[PDB]
Amino acid sequence: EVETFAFQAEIAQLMSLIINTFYSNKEIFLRELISNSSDALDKIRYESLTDPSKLDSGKELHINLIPNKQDRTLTIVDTGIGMTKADLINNLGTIAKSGTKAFMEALQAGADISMIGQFGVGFYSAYLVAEKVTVITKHNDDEQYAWESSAGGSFTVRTDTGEPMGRGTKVILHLKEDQTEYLEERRIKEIVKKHSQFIGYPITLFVEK
Amino acid sequence: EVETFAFQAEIAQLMSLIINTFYSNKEIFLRELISNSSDALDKIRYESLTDPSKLDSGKELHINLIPNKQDRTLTIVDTGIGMTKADLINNLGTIAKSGTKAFMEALQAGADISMIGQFGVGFYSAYLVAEKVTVITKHNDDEQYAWESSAGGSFTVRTDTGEPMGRGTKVILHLKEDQTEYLEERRIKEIVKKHSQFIGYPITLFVEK
Ligand SMILES: CCOc1ccc(-c2snnc2-c2cc(CC)c(O)cc2O)cc1
Ligand SMILES: CCOc1ccc(-c2snnc2-c2cc(CC)c(O)cc2O)cc1
Ligand SMILES: [Mg+2]
Structure with a gap:
C-alpha cells in the first residue's frame, strides 16, 4: 500500500537545483x-475562531524541534492544520509549479536561494541539508499519511501507522553525512534566534540523552 | 442594510498604534x-489545480494599482480567492487577535512597525496612509460585499451593488491629506521596485488622464 509518484518536471528541476548548486548558507x-x-498553525487557529471543535484533535498550537544524533535526524513537529492526502500529492499543499517558475525568474534577476520562501516552495530547501525527507501529517478531514522522497524524481505516499499525531505535520530530515551540525543544540538555538525569533508560537528545542 | 460592528479590543489597539505612533517609513x-x-492569488491558484471551474469567475491572476488624484484614492485590486462575509467580519480573514499580541511582544523586543506583516496583520498598515479604507470582495462561495472603516473602533459591512468584480478583493485607500505622494506614478513605481519586485503575478500600475 505504498504509492509512488513522479514529481512534476518543474519540481524535479527545483530539487536538482537545490541539491546541486553550490550555496553555503544552508541554515535557511x-x-x-x-x-x-507557523502558516499551518495560523490556518488551524483561524478555522477554530468559528468552529472551536476543530481543536478537539489538540488545543495546543506549537512547534517542537527534535534532534536525534543516533538516527542522524532533525524533526520539526507542529500542531497546525495538517495536510490531506490530496494536499501531500499536490506538492505538499504548495503552488510549486508556478512558485518554481517565479523563483527561477528571480534567480536570473539577481535573487539567491535564501529567497526561496518568497515563492511558496521553501519546503524544498530541506534538500540543502537532507538526503531524504519524510513528512507525516494528519488533517482533521483525513487519515494520517507519510510522504517521503530522496529526490531523484519520485516520492511515495502511504497510510501511516506510526504513532498517532492528533493533528499537524512532522518533517523528518535524514541529514547528509556532512550536515550533522544541525543536530547540535547550540547551532539550532543560534539559527532559531537569528531567523525565527519573532514566530508567534512556542518553539521547543528538545534535548538528547 | 449596513451592519456596523465593533472591532475586538486588541485590533482597535493595533489600529490606534498604527495611527498614532510616529513612524516615517509609511511606504511599507x-x-x-x-x-x-499575492497570498490570495496563490490560494485561488491552488484550489484551481484540482478544480479548474474555480477560475470560471476569471482566469487571469493579477494585481492592479490604480491611483485617482481627484478622489485622492489609491486602489489595489487583485483577482485572488476573495473573502466571504464571515471572513470580512473575522478581521479580513486574519488571525488578528493572536497576530496583534505577537506583534506587540515583538515591538517590545526591538522590532519596528515595518515587521507587521510577519504577524499576519499587515492589512492594518493601510492606516499609516489612509483615513478610511474600503474593501470590496467577491469569493466564489458568496455575494459581493463592501467592508469599510475610518478606524475609531467600528467597521461596516454591506452587500455591495458597485461594479461586479468577478472574483477577488479591491482595497480602496482614501488617503490622508498629507500622504498624496502615494498617488504619483514615480513614487508607486519606486516602492514596487524596492519591495515587491519578485512578486509572482503581474502588477499593473494604471495611469491617469
Ligand atoms: C508557503 C507555505 O505553503 C504551505 C502549505 C502548506 C502548509 C501546511 S498545511 N499542514 N501542514 C503544513 C506544513 C507543510 C510543511 C511543508 C512540508 C511544513 O514544513 C510544515 C507544515 O506544517 C504550510 C505552508
Ligand atoms: C497574512 C495574510 O492573511 C490574508 C488573509 C486573507 C487574504 C485574502 S483572501 N481574499 N482576499 C484577501 C485579501 C485580503 C487583503 C487584506 C484586506 C488584501 O489586501 C488583499 C487580499 O487579496 C490575504 C491575506
Ligand atoms: Mg507568508
Whole structure:
C-alpha cells in the first residue's frame, strides 16, 4: 500500500537545483520549515475562531524541534492544520509549479536561494541539508499519511501507522553525512534566534540523552 | 442594510498604534497589501489545480494599482480567492487577535512597525496612509460585499451593488491629506521596485488622464 509518484518536471528541476548548486548558507532550511509550520498553525487557529471543535484533535498550537544524533535526524513537529492526502500529492499543499517558475525568474534577476520562501516552495530547501525527507501529517478531514522522497524524481505516499499525531505535520530530515551540525543544540538555538525569533508560537528545542 | 460592528479590543489597539505612533517609513503599507494580494492569488491558484471551474469567475491572476488624484484614492485590486462575509467580519480573514499580541511582544523586543506583516496583520498598515479604507470582495462561495472603516473602533459591512468584480478583493485607500505622494506614478513605481519586485503575478500600475 505504498504509492509512488513522479514529481512534476518543474519540481524535479527545483530539487536538482537545490541539491546541486553550490550555496553555503544552508541554515535557511530551518527558517523556511518553521515558517511553514507557523502558516499551518495560523490556518488551524483561524478555522477554530468559528468552529472551536476543530481543536478537539489538540488545543495546543506549537512547534517542537527534535534532534536525534543516533538516527542522524532533525524533526520539526507542529500542531497546525495538517495536510490531506490530496494536499501531500499536490506538492505538499504548495503552488510549486508556478512558485518554481517565479523563483527561477528571480534567480536570473539577481535573487539567491535564501529567497526561496518568497515563492511558496521553501519546503524544498530541506534538500540543502537532507538526503531524504519524510513528512507525516494528519488533517482533521483525513487519515494520517507519510510522504517521503530522496529526490531523484519520485516520492511515495502511504497510510501511516506510526504513532498517532492528533493533528499537524512532522518533517523528518535524514541529514547528509556532512550536515550533522544541525543536530547540535547550540547551532539550532543560534539559527532559531537569528531567523525565527519573532514566530508567534512556542518553539521547543528538545534535548538528547 | 449596513451592519456596523465593533472591532475586538486588541485590533482597535493595533489600529490606534498604527495611527498614532510616529513612524516615517509609511511606504511599507503597499508592500504589505501586495503581499496579501499575492497570498490570495496563490490560494485561488491552488484550489484551481484540482478544480479548474474555480477560475470560471476569471482566469487571469493579477494585481492592479490604480491611483485617482481627484478622489485622492489609491486602489489595489487583485483577482485572488476573495473573502466571504464571515471572513470580512473575522478581521479580513486574519488571525488578528493572536497576530496583534505577537506583534506587540515583538515591538517590545526591538522590532519596528515595518515587521507587521510577519504577524499576519499587515492589512492594518493601510492606516499609516489612509483615513478610511474600503474593501470590496467577491469569493466564489458568496455575494459581493463592501467592508469599510475610518478606524475609531467600528467597521461596516454591506452587500455591495458597485461594479461586479468577478472574483477577488479591491482595497480602496482614501488617503490622508498629507500622504498624496502615494498617488504619483514615480513614487508607486519606486516602492514596487524596492519591495515587491519578485512578486509572482503581474502588477499593473494604471495611469491617469
Ligand atoms: C508557503 C507555505 O505553503 C504551505 C502549505 C502548506 C502548509 C501546511 S498545511 N499542514 N501542514 C503544513 C506544513 C507543510 C510543511 C511543508 C512540508 C511544513 O514544513 C510544515 C507544515 O506544517 C504550510 C505552508
Ligand atoms: C497574512 C495574510 O492573511 C490574508 C488573509 C486573507 C487574504 C485574502 S483572501 N481574499 N482576499 C484577501 C485579501 C485580503 C487583503 C487584506 C484586506 C488584501 O489586501 C488583499 C487580499 O487579496 C490575504 C491575506
Ligand atoms: Mg507568508
